Design a protein around this ligand. Sequence first.
Ligand code: PRO
Lengths: 194, 202
Amino acid sequence: AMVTLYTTKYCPYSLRARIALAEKKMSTDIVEAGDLEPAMIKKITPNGVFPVLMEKDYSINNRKALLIYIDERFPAPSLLPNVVNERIKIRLSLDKIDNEWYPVLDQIRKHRSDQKMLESMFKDLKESLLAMEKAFTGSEFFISSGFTLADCYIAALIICLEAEGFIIDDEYGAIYEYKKRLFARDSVKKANIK
Amino acid sequence: AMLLYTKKDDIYSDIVRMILLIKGANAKIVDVSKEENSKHLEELNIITPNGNIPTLSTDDFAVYRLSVIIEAIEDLYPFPPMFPVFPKQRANARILLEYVNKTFLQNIIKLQSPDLDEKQANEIKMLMQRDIISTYKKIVSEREVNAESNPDAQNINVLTLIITFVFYYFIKLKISIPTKDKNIIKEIKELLSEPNFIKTIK
Ligand code: PRO
């Protein structure tokens, strides 16, 4: 009731924010936009960018800054590794996921009407995942001991790729096990139901 | 154990070198453009996808994007604090840093390409002149806000630092700073006269 997150359906930035807020056990309440008038929508976020986290008179919708703000605004439990060197590599992974993997989801959405262009995009995305299957071996979550923001980034990316028709199944190996572990977690599956 | 891969006249390299200087860190600065350090150049393309400059490398990691490097330096050297103290201000500092990078920093880099058209280079310069003063005023305001929230605290305002090199490379690239405001001119001269900045540009 104190803080409110305004979300959009099928948006990975909205999904990974709900996963992160749930991991924080914050008293914030989710409010699905689209159910609100443009008079309210244009007042929530002036530039119409979702998701939007607001409390009091502050309001943040910057994509690359939202979850970092979430983890710092509600500090416990920490969503970054405690060891400095692991945290530095997680920060680089977050930048690589936002700049090199989320655009793959973006182009799959934009050209989903073209079946032949879609089949090739799914084919290149499978080869990309299978190439880094070794990086998912020997860790309960993504290259870390515990649940981090990277697991939030990846979960929302898998949920949205699943809706587009891209499924991670038995053939991905350690990636598939990590996915099964990832979706077993309460915050991920609370946001995955639809 | 910490190594910083560097290129001459790279504005990202000069920013990071001034940051490492303030935090009291002692990293090995390697100008990769020089022929003597060509053995390090071979090492860089191994640990980075595109021989990224600059790159902060230790025995454990190798990071290369400016926002990531600044965040990593803040983990390795907490003193003095890099960002503001409150979370909304810290988020605002990261949004503004993303903006200064998109419109100024990587356009300063594009102007160093050798195959640029005259009209192309002039549009890049004119577009930065269009927003430089407006950007500088936001940085001063956001710096005055954080000072109000914490007078005792003394963090290195990283945006004021980065904007100092924007002005320095403005001067290097013969781009004029479009303002007749004698106060703004007085402050830009004072930014360029900070001792840590003077030590960085040799
Ligand atoms: O935008 C960045 O952060 C990277 C740094 C080197 C050039 N591009």
